[PDB]
Design an enzyme around this catalytic site. Sequence first.
Site, PDB file in Angstrom:
ATOM      1  N   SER A 129       0.784  -1.191   0.100  1.00  0.00           N
ATOM      2  CA  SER A 129       0.001  -0.051  -0.134  1.00  0.00           C
ATOM      3  C   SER A 129       0.809   1.383  -0.077  1.00  0.00           C
ATOM      4  CB  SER A 129      -1.030   0.058   1.225  1.00  0.00           C
ATOM      5  OG  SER A 129      -0.177   0.004   2.247  1.00  0.00           O
ATOM      6  N   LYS A 161     -11.261  -3.566   1.780  1.00  0.00           N
ATOM      7  CA  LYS A 161     -10.989  -2.596   0.864  1.00  0.00           C
ATOM      8  C   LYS A 161     -12.085  -2.493  -0.159  1.00  0.00           C
ATOM      9  CE  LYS A 161      -7.134  -2.509   3.093  1.00  0.00           C
ATOM     10  NZ  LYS A 161      -7.197  -3.871   3.725  1.00  0.00           N
ATOM     11  N   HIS A 213      -4.967  -5.463  -1.078  1.00  0.00           N
ATOM     12  CA  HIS A 213      -5.234  -4.597  -1.838  1.00  0.00           C
ATOM     13  C   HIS A 213      -5.445  -4.723  -3.252  1.00  0.00           C
ATOM     14  CE1 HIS A 213      -4.471  -1.007   0.933  1.00  0.00           C
ATOM     15  NE2 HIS A 213      -3.643  -1.840   1.583  1.00  0.00           N
TER      16      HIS A 213
END
Lengths: 423, 62, 492
Positions: free
Chosen positions: C267, C327, C295
């Site tokens: 990230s 997410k 992610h």
Amino acid sequence: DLTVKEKEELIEEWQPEPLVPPVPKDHPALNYNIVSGPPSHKTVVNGKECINFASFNFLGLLDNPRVKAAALASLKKYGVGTCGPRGFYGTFDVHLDLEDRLAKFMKTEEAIIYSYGFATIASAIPAYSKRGDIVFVDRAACFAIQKGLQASRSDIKLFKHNDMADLERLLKEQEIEDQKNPRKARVTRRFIVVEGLYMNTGTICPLPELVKLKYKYKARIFLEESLSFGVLGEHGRGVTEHYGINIDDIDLISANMENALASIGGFCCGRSFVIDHQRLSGQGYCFSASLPPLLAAAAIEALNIMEENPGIFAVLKEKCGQIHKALQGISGLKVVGESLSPAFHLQLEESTGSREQDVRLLQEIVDQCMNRSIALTQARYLEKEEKCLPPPSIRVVVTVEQTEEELERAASTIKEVAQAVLL
Amino acid sequence: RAWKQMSWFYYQYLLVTALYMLEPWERTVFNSMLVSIVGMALYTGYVFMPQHIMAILHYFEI
Amino acid sequence: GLYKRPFNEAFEETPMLVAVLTYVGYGVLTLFGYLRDFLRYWRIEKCHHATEREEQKDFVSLYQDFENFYTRNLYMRIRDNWNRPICSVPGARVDIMERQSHDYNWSFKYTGNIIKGVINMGSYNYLGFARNTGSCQEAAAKVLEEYGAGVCSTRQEIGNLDKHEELEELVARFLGVEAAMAYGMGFATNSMNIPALVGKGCLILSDELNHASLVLGARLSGATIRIFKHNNMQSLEKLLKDAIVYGQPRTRRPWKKILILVEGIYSMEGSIVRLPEVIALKKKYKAYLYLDEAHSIGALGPTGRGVVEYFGLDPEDVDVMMGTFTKSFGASGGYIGGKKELIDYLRTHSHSAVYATSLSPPVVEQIITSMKCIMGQDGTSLGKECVQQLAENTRYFRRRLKEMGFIIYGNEDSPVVPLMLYMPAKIGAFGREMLKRNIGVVVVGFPATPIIESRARFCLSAAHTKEILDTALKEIDEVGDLLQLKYSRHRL
């Protein structure tokens, strides 16, 4: 040293272990109970209608229409997801309102909200205790406390369950060790990690003596109140409400909102001096998403329901007393717990040599009960990981919802089934 | 328009020297120490260093 | 390891002058922190800090002073850029409650006003499933009305519901693996299921930039932990060779197992892992692979299946595939996917399966409906359009910022855009200047990222339209001119 040829054949010869060892087919935990619907009172387990004596829902707030309506309103306002940590645009107004509500409910300066019942204590303990500190934890403590103590690298010294003479012995020995090396004694912090009502055993801790020991041997106190948060005392503030101990003596009080409040999460309450450090040194706090708004609103509405009338605590107390009294006298089993305890245990009096056969006996009793419309459960442990593995035991949980007649039927059913199986 | 330029230059000085974070009295303390050291260096240069280098620099600037 | 399409990523180095000025700034802050600490200790200035109660003065001090040094003297000065409360669904535009401080960020008082229509780039809704209206919300509302909110017991005992089984088989069909299991927290997933897989006598080859959950999971188990440089596959090969050839440290016995902990998208850096090379290495050296896809499970891939679809590989090669629903799908949770024997072993021998409470029934329905929307079950074309729009947004944003003169890290396909500031004062300045212009951004610093590399991370989304992106680009350009944030020697 080694040639390239030798290293190449060494790499060729090596064959690693399989990722996961084979699991026996006849493993009881391998088969799961399928609950066709909500796990409420009078549920359906494995397709058979049963009265729920297995779920940690003490106050019956799981399917309260007010709680559902509050959660639905919050879901309409915000939705299901927070989409971020508490630091990065994941702090809602409901989270702050819930933290304030808990702080006011427990008569405490501050409280902090974790999004999972394990992580709250497993992240509270490593924050304050570092390598080199001394921790005196009870022998019979939940797995979450053990993992929290393992995550930090302090020195853990177990003591016998609810034995204050043994804590005196340990603290006196540590006093001698402090006398030998004052320089390290000035920089070594002592903690005492205990639980209000023990999930494994079902008993309660002696807070008065523990507090006198804290003020005699300068050792801070951490309290876990998973079971006793919403069931003990007049207004249900925990075991400090029960004994009458001033809450300022207890340094940190951690519980989970999942048993009584019936919403996913956990919290830790204390003075601001102690709590404010967790907002940065708490791994479950900094490095994970926040609680969904609907769960937080359900927790707030549950707090409102608890604060409106404290008589449900009295009725739960009388139900626990009555079922505990009725369960006495089984031919093959024995009750482990205290009268005031909502969730206690039934364990075999004369236990056979092998643990697997004991688990098989208890599961046959549980199945024979479940056919007669009582949904009992058996305490589940990790045999290898647990430091102190309790004996196998059937779990009995009591709720304000279960009427007197259902308690009498449950007691008589367990008596018949146990006396038949153990015969 | 020159005042806006000079205020921007001061703002950049605050950003570079991390004085943006600090309270006003901390900024004043830092500025006082800096000007004191600058004055000391100027006096030491006047005492020993020849002014010929200064004249050459002034001619180069002009 | 063969790449069917080019792997273009860039990590431009810190200019010398900017590094020098960063060190000067940190030094100035350190000296003034020492001065403030000295004044506070001698009570020349009043302290806005809580003190241990008078009955506990002779106790050993709970906090060693040097331990909190960074927090009191450095983090507190710009604390206003973090924990900003919001009062709306974190969509493309978010509502932020306005708060002010009068004692320099030690305590915050909420003014009445609410900032409306703030362009939001700190939330993780890549696919735009964070909405308070839709079919997901209706389904979650029905399940909330019926099942109630929250379950009150552990999975093994009575907390296993039919919703959980539906979700697990749904995940299994989604990823492409034989079986999957679901947990109530991704942090919990890692920290409770890495210790189950390995123990003492096993090696964990961890990346340099791994998440805190993976590091905690590795620490909890007794396995020996070794670290290789971030996406340096020569370093990974060297560590693999040494571990296989030499063996256990004290007694030069062979290892029981070698587990490689990697992520899909990192990230902070924004770099996609070089999966084909990792798979080639793990096949050559008989290692096991644990791939964290928090992610990338929704953002990446033509149909949003993750990195293993982005690269075109086979999901069967990866041994363990972790993932998080927070997410992209917009609901809290986590999962692990793999073969049937692995999942049976985890169902029997996982800490959360035995000691932790199940997912909430309202959340699992949001996850189910989001997945059925992505993979085309609902009959609508929302699954394709969301992914295509997210890809277009990422291309447009990264291209425009790179051709302005900023320094951007990471692969050119990753939706997380870390812009680099490099200085401590500019961390606070960028956040405040952006918020004045109605853009919310996440500025991170010293604890999450190295001391010199301070960044602002933009998490793009399929919710952002071209007008929102154009407005954000104009404002970021103006602020970059204001703060002199264009440190790129290549393009401008």
